[PDB]
Amino acid sequence: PDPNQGLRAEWMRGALGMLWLPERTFNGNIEGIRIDDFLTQIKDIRTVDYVQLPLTSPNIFSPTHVAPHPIIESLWQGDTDANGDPINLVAPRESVDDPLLSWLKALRAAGLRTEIYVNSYNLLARIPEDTQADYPDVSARWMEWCDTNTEAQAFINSQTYHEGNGRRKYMFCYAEFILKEYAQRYGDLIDAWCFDSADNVMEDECGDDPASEDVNDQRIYQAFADACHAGNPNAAIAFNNSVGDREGNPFTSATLFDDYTFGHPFGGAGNMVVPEALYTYNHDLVVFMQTNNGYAFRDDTRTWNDNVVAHFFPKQSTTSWNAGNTPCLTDEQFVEWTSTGIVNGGGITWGTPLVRTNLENAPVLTLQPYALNQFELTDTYLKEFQSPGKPNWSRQYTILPAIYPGQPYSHNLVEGVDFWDPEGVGITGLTASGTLPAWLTISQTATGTWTLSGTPPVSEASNYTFELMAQDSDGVTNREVKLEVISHPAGFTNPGDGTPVWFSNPMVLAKATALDYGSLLKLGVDFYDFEGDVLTITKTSGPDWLVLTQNSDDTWRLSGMPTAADAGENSFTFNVSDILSSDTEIKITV
Ligand SMILES: [Ca+2]
Ligand SMILES: [Ca+2]
Ligand SMILES: [Ca+2]
Ligand SMILES: [Ca+2]
Ligand SMILES: [Ca+2]
């Protein structure tokens, strides 16, 4: 077996996780969507370690991806609706946006690891008898591509174990061409993969056996696992092979390629903790993680699965994992369930509910107020009790800002935010060790606030990796940090006076029609600031139809319906500011 099976998910022991999952991502709906509102909302939640994002959506939405891919995008064939909106487009366009990349980098910037949801049916149809109006021909076109493509047919014939029951060869094609490409593109930005509906497609239809410990019985599981590991060899994999046994071991036995347990709770649909017997069965799963120190399969007659990490994927609301207006647990219970499961135990991806997940029906992609409240109480508990004694650091990473050669550097590490004393006495001091830059300096500017400051020279062009050391009465705790020099984008000229600049003047965008427009303005593509100052954009003149709205610090969305009188050549003036500013003309033919 694999010697690092489960060890690569060692960080998941004691890990608190959330879920951010929009719905109805197809046909360009996900393009321009950002997670930055959600992350700003949870800025004070400091013990949280990771967030699960989708690559695909669940159930019949498994073909719909939230990241671009040439092969998936070729299945579109420019097909349109009655309104003119896309149909059979089950991924964002390469020319328009890569939303998943923005969320991955924003999560990394926030000091968090990431889990990636993939439904195992992927581009195949879960119910072939039915027809999905928004993407009806995609499943057929994907299979059409697999059996009529030189590289794909060559791959299918390269191993004897590809051919078999049902749509087996097509599953291998997704792993090789789609999943591997996604994995290798994003690299270490993805820390984990959870594969839903695995036994449904892999075991029952395609004829693998996840209960076995022969690799010849688990080649579809291998292909998916190796495709992830080709991009990041430390990426923890988990397969949903249904729920285990409520009386004994609650997790279904690990395959040869499970680093952690998927951990679907008992009573899938409906409220997972009603009646009292269902509450107890799912709480026994939480207690099982405590009892076995976060290792799922120490009990059985297999030593190769002893490092596999016990992990649970419950839902915070009463209805769904990604939404719901009612919490299933009380405030006291939610803190107990979480702490019992992770504190010297396993990991939990909480199905944290957003206010409204449907992108077509006025989406609000931030946590329910009651859900945030439960995490605030959990945060206060885990700050004190998860790792008592020496100081604890926040989340998984501490991210220092990039080095701008010549410019002043300044970043505060605040007590209570980036580090804290569990007992609540206080931080006695903060120092560093290792190869620091000569210019860089640590000092306590105000009470409970240490500042990493200094001014790099213009010739600064190297990386630095060193330890930060938070100290209190009980002892001292280390935290590795990185300092990288900024890489400016191509096609941008530095004015050398602090002025933020547009890409060009004029700047023409795509054409519009009288009845909705859609276009994105992005940092480093359409506008840029060489000091890295946060920017503001304002429409200062032009026709009324063009609506401007900010999605994040680095993304702005242009929208709105042109009237009959707006046909021709519409000119707008757009400003970009930080004190200093500069205008530009933006033309749009209609
Ligand atoms: Ca933590
Ligand atoms: Ca064992
Ligand atoms: Ca639509
Ligand atoms: Ca202490
Ligand atoms: Ca500036």
Side-chain angles (χ1 to χ4, degrees), residues 1-42 44-128 130-149 152-275 277-331 333-510 512 514 516-568 570-578 581-582 584-586 588 590:
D2 192 300
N4 295 304
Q5 179 170 13
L7 293 169
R8 58 167 131 275
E10 175 55 45
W11 63 264
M12 201 172 292
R13 292 176 67 254
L16 176 55
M18 297 186 188
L19 182 65
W20 191 84
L21 176 59
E23 296 185 46
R24 307 191 83 76
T25 60
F26 51 75
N27 301 325
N29 293 334
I30 203 64
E31 294 176 343
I33 299 297
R34 296 287 177 273
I35 201 162
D36 297 57
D37 290 359
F38 167 81
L39 299 180
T40 305
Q41 191 194 21
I42 68 167
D44 303 327
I45 300 159
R46 293 283 97 191
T47 56
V48 68
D49 296 289
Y50 66 102
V51 181
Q52 185 180 120
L53 299 173
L55 180 56
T56 69
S57 285
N59 201 53
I60 68 192
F61 310 98
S62 70
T64 65
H65 290 66
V66 304
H69 201 281
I71 296 165
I72 298 167
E73 198 173 332
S74 71
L75 311 187
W76 179 30
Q77 313 182 354
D79 297 343
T80 56
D81 211 339
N83 292 16
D85 300 307
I87 299 292
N88 294 299
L89 178 61
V90 294
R93 289 158 278 189
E94 276 193 319
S95 56
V96 180
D97 196 39
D98 184 357
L100 182 51
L101 182 52
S102 183
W103 313 333
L104 287 168
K105 292 180 76 166
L107 284 164
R108 174 58 69 77
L112 296 160
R113 287 174 184 272
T114 67
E115 192 178 23
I116 299 295
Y117 179 94
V118 180
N119 190 277
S120 294
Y121 282 96
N122 61 81
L123 295 160
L124 300 337
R126 195 203 188 79
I127 310 96
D130 300 350
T131 306
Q132 310 303 319
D134 299 277
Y135 46 97
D137 306 302
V138 172
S139 295
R141 287 171 199 181
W142 162 243
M143 294 168 71
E144 171 76 310
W145 183 89
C146 286
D147 54 42
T148 62
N149 175 262
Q153 285 284 97
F155 171 70
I156 294 155
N157 299 5
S158 70
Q159 307 290 357
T160 54
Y161 60 78
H162 292 327
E163 297 276 19
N165 294 358
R167 293 167 284 186
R168 189 186 170 84
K169 68 181 171 182
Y170 303 107
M171 291 283 291
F172 282 102
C173 287
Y174 182 84
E176 181 62 23
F177 294 105
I178 312 307
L179 186 58
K180 192 178 172 182
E181 192 75 2
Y182 282 130
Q184 290 194 317
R185 190 191 298 168
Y186 304 126
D188 64 27
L189 295 172
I190 299 165
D191 302 88
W193 299 83
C194 68
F195 287 100
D196 195 20
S197 312
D199 65 335
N200 295 99
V201 71
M202 302 182 178
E203 189 189 335
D204 300 344
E205 192 188 316
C206 300
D208 276 15
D209 185 19
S212 176
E213 61 185 296
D214 193 321
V215 71
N216 294 292
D217 304 347
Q218 305 185 346
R219 296 290 187 183
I220 303 163
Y221 291 93
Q222 188 171 48
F224 276 55
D226 294 355
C228 297
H229 295 129
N232 178 4
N234 304 310
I237 316 304
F239 294 96
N240 191 353
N241 293 320
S242 300
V243 74
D245 186 38
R246 68 249 277 278
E247 302 301 327
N249 194 311
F251 311 107
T252 300
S253 186
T255 64
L256 294 167
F257 310 96
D258 277 299
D259 295 299
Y260 65 105
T261 59
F262 193 89
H264 200 85
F266 300 96
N271 181 6
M272 65 157 202
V273 296
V274 71
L278 256 168
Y279 184 105
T280 305
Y281 289 135
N282 286 303
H283 190 258
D284 287 348
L285 192 159
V286 166
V287 173
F288 188 93
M289 293 164 71
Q290 191 178 226
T291 305
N292 302 290
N293 244 249
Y295 294 110
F297 308 113
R298 224 84 147 180
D299 63 320
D300 65 16
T301 67
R302 297 173 173 182
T303 62
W304 61 262
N305 68 18
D306 288 357
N307 290 324
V308 174
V309 177
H311 159 271
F312 188 37
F313 188 14
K315 54 185 171 195
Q316 183 171 19
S317 81
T318 54
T319 45
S320 63
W321 275 261
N322 66 326
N325 303 112
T326 311
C328 64
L329 300 172
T330 66
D331 287 8
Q333 290 171 347
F334 188 90
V335 175
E336 183 269 302
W337 277 56
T338 304
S339 58
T340 304
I342 76 187
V343 176
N344 312 320
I348 301 170
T349 309
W350 271 109
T352 58
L354 303 169
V355 174
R356 203 173 299 97
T357 54
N358 191 343
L359 295 170
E360 300 186 317
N361 189 39
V364 179
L365 306 176
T366 56
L367 295 178
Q368 283 280 2
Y370 75 82
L372 185 70
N373 180 45
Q374 285 186 339
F375 271 87
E376 287 169 342
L377 296 167
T378 307
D379 192 56
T380 305
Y381 188 89
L382 294 171
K383 278 179 163 185
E384 188 176 351
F385 292 111
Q386 183 161 20
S387 294
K390 296 174 163 67
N392 305 351
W393 286 80
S394 72
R395 313 193 157 185
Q396 292 291 303
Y397 314 116
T398 297
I399 309 300
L400 304 177
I403 306 173
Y404 288 79
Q407 308 302 311
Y409 192 93
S410 195
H411 181 81
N412 290 344
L413 301 170
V414 185
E415 187 182 353
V417 176
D418 297 278
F419 48 79
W420 62 88
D421 176 19
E423 283 70 39
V425 181
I427 298 293
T428 52
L430 189 76
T431 61
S433 60
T435 301
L436 283 69
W439 60 265
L440 186 66
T441 306
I442 298 167
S443 58
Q444 186 163 24
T445 51
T447 191
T449 301
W450 286 260
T451 304
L452 276 66
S453 55
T455 315
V458 180
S459 60
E460 181 66 79
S462 59
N463 278 21
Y464 300 86
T465 302
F466 49 93
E467 301 291 342
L468 295 178
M469 303 185 295
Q471 195 196 341
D472 69 13
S473 59
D474 292 298
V476 58
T477 306
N478 302 343
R479 166 54 70 84
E480 189 176 305
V481 291
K482 299 92 173 180
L483 261 176
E484 304 190 345
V485 177
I486 193 64
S487 175
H488 297 298
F492 279 92
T493 306
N494 195 332
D497 61 353
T499 303
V501 296
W502 294 90
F503 177 69
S504 54
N505 188 8
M507 184 186 304
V508 190
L509 311 180
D516 293 305
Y517 188 70
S519 183
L520 301 176
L521 298 172
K522 295 195 270 185
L523 185 67
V525 179
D526 300 292
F527 59 97
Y528 188 66
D529 185 70
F530 289 82
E531 290 71 33
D533 298 330
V534 70
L535 307 180
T536 311
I537 289 169
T538 303
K539 183 184 172 208
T540 58
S541 73
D544 189 65
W545 68 269
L546 188 63
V547 178
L548 180 64
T549 43
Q550 188 173 11
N551 298 355
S552 62
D553 286 12
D554 56 45
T555 308
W556 288 72
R557 185 156 187 282
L558 295 168
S559 77
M561 200 194 298
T563 60
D566 299 319
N570 292 219
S571 185
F572 311 91
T573 305
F574 272 74
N575 191 93
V576 67
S577 181
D578 54 20
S581 61
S582 66
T584 192
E585 193 188 334
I586 289 175
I588 299 174
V590 183

